[PDB]
Design a protein around this nucleic acid. Sequence first.
RNA 1: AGAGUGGACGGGAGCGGCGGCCCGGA
RNA 2: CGAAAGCCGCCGUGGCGCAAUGAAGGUGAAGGCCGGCGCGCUCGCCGGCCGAGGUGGGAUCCCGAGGCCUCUCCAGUCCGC
RNA 3: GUCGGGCCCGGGGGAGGCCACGCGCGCGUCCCCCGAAGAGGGGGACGGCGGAGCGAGCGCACGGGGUCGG
Lengths: 125, 187, 53, 225, 48
Amino acid sequence: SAHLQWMVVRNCSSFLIKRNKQTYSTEPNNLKARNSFRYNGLIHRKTVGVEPAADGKGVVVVIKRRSGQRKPATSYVRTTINKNARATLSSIRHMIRKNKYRPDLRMAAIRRASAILRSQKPVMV
Amino acid sequence: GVDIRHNKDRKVRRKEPKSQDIYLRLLVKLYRFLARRTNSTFNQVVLKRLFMSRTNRPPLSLSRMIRKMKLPGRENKTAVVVGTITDDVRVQEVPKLKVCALRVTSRARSRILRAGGKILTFDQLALDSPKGCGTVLLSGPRKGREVYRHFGKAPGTPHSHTKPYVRSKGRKFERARGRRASRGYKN
Amino acid sequence: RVKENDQKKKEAKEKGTWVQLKRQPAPPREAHFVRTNGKEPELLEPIPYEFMA
Amino acid sequence: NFAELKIKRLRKKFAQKMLRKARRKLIYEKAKHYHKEYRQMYRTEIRMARMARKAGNFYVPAEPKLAFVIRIRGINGVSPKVRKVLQLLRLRQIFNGTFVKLNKASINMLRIVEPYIAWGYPNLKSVNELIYKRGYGKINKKRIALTDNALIARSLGKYGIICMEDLIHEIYTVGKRFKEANNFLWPFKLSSPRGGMKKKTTHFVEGGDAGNREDQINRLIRRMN
Amino acid sequence: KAMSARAEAIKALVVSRKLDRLAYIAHPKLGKRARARIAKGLRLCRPK
RNA sequence: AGAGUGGACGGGAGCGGCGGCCCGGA
RNA sequence: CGAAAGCCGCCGUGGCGCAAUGAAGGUGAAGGCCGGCGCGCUCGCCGGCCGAGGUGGGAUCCCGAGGCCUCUCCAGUCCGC
RNA sequence: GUCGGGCCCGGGGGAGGCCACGCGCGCGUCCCCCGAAGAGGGGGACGGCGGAGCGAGCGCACGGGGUCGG
Ligand SMILES: [Mg+2]
Ligand SMILES: [Mg+2]
Ligand SMILES: [Mg+2]
Ligand SMILES: [Mg+2]
Ligand SMILES: [Mg+2]
Ligand SMILES: [Mg+2]
Ligand SMILES: [Mg+2]
Ligand SMILES: [Mg+2]
Ligand SMILES: [Mg+2]
Ligand SMILES: [Mg+2]
C-alpha cells in the first residue's frame, strides 16, 4: 500500500538527502526530486518518470505497468522520443492526459522534459 | 504592559498519538479528516481517544460489553470501543454482536465469531457508518487499577481508605502504632 | 420573594401580559422639574472663623 | 443538464442579490430613524430646560446612564481590590477605555477605582468617533476590526443589532441589550493624550485627571482617540 | 389512575408602517414573494 | 468540468419564452 | 559473525496477578420479580424466570411532532437538512 | 405656550422644496360621487395579498494592504 509504504520510507530511505535545510530524493522515477508522497517513484500503483536518452539525443519516458506489480523486471515500460521540442511535450501530455495515467504529475513531467531537452541541446558561446 | 497571567495559556492536551505506530497514524489521519470535514461529535471523540495513552484506554471486557448491549433500545447497533476487547471466562453464553475495536484478543475474537457476530476495525467502520450512526460508544473502567487504589488522601489520615505502599503484606508490616488504639492511636 | 414571583407569573400568564420579575440595581434619576414656588432660593455663605474650643 | 443547471444557479444568484438590496434599504432607513430620534432628544432636552426657565422653575435633567471610563495609570503596584475591579471593568492596560452603564453598583465600583481611571459622560460625537475609528468586536474570542455590517449582524443580529448604527444607538441610548453590545465591543485601546495631562496622579477637581470629569471626558476623547 | 385522569382532562376540549415592511421584506424566508414582486415590477412592462 | 444554502421523476395538469399555416420540444 | 539467534510446554517449577480479613484457630464476597400456603410472622416451604441494585448528573448514540424545497398546480412516489 | 409627539392623526382648495416613491389583471383595505334603502353601480389611493422560469452592454471609482503602459 502507498500510504503504508510512505509511513515506512518517509524518514528512512537510501534515496533521502537531508542537507542544509532542504530534503531531496534520488529514486529513478521521481519528477521534481523531492521527499513527498505525491512525487515518490516507488510506492504508487502508477508512476511516470522522464530521463535523458542513452545517446545524448531525446527523452525516455518510463511509465509503470499495471499488472506485474511484484515483478520489477517487467514492471516498467519505457519509450524513447527523439522528436523536436513542441511535439515531445505534446506527446507526453497526450500520453498522461489521454491515458488518464496519474494526471497530477502532468505539469511536473512537462517541466522536467523541457529541462532535459534544453540541457541536451548544444551549448552556445 | 497588560495584567494577565500566562501560567494557564498553554492547554495540556494530546494533539497526536505519542506512538510511532504507522497503522495508528494512518487511522488517525482518516479520523482527523472525518472530524474536520464532518459534523460528527462521534468522530471528534474517537479522534481524541485515539490520541490518548494506554492507561487512558483501559481494556473493555466482553461481559461488560454484553451488558451494555443488552441494555434497552440497542438492538443491532455497532458497539464501538477504542481500546481492547478482552475475554471474560465468567460468562458462558455469548449473543451475536457487531463490534468495532482497535484490538480484540484471540479467545474473545473466537467467541464472538463462533457465536456468529462481526468484528470491525476503524477503517471498515468508516466504510460502513462514516457518520457514526447506530453506534454505542463504550469505554473500559479507567479508574480500575492499583495506582488508583493507592491514590487519594494519605493513609495516616482520617477517614482515608488509601492503600499504603508496603513491601510485604503481613502482621509485621504496618499494623502497629497508628493502626489500632491499643498502640498509640487508631484514626 | 420566590412565592411573590410565582404568584406574579401565574397572574401574568392568566391575564395575558408580560411583567417584570427580576430586580434592578437603583437606576439613575429620571429628569424632573423643581418648582421654586415663586420664592427665590436662599443664599448660603461660609462663616467667618472664630475660636471657641 | 448544462442549461437547466446554469439557469438555476443564475436564479439563485439573482435572489441573493435582491436580498442584499433589501437589507441595504433597511439599514439606510434605520439610520435615518436614529437621526430623527437623536435630533428629537436633543431639542426635547433644550425645550424642557427652556420651558422651566420661562416658568421660573428649575429643570434637573436626567443623570446620565452611559459613562466612558479610561484606565490612565499603569499596572505596577496596584491593590488587589483595585486590580479585580479594573479587570471586571476590562481595563487591563493603560489608556484602555470602555463604556459602562451607570447605576449604583457600577458607580460604587468606579468609586473604588477612582485614582486609576478618568471617566465621564460621552456625547454622541464621542460614541461615533470611538465606534468608527477604534471599533473592534469580539468574534469567537478574537479581536476583529469592525469593517462589515455582516460581521456585526452575524454576532448580534439576534437582538436586532445588524449595523454599526444599531450598535451606536444601543450604546448611546442604553437599550435592553446594552450588556451584549458592550461585551461584543473589545475594550478601546486609545493613544496617548496629545497635549498631555497636567497631572496623572491626582483628582480632576484638584488639577489632575483621575475621577469624574463630567463632560470634559469628551475633550479627553478628542485628544486621545 | 392519575395518568388517566390527566389524559381525560387534556382531551376534554371543545397600516403601511414602512420600517416594519422593510424588515418583513428583508427577512430571508418571509420576504421572498414580496421582493420577487418588486423585481418583476421593476423589470416588466404591461400598460394601464 | 467538480459543482449540491434540497435535489428527484413520471405519469398528473396548465402557463411565460423560442420554432404559423394555430401543430411543436435536447 | 555466533558469548548471537532459534526452539522446548508432561521444562511454567516459580514469581507477580486472579480475594480479602483476623493476633490467631480460622472464615471467606449477587440480588430482584412472580405465584401459592404457615402467622407470606419483616418472613420459611417449593416452583418459575431474569442476572451485580437504585437515584441524580453524564461525552456519544436512537426515535422524533413540526419545518425548509423543485416554472407551477392535482396524487403519491424517493432520499436531504 | 411648544421650529413638542402622533411613519408631522386628518380632510378640502390655488398660475415651490423633499422622497432608498413609481409594470400589469384580479383580490382585499380605505376614500369620493349617483346614491333611485345611505342598495346596486361610476371612479381614485394603499397593500407585507393572489398558480406558473431570464434584462445585458460598456465604463468611472475616497471601493477585500503600490503602482507607473514615468
Ligand atoms: Mg508586552
Ligand atoms: Mg512569565
Ligand atoms: Mg509606582
Ligand atoms: Mg506636539
Ligand atoms: Mg503613589
Ligand atoms: Mg539463547
Ligand atoms: Mg503462572
Ligand atoms: Mg504452580
Ligand atoms: Mg411637527
Ligand atoms: Mg398626515
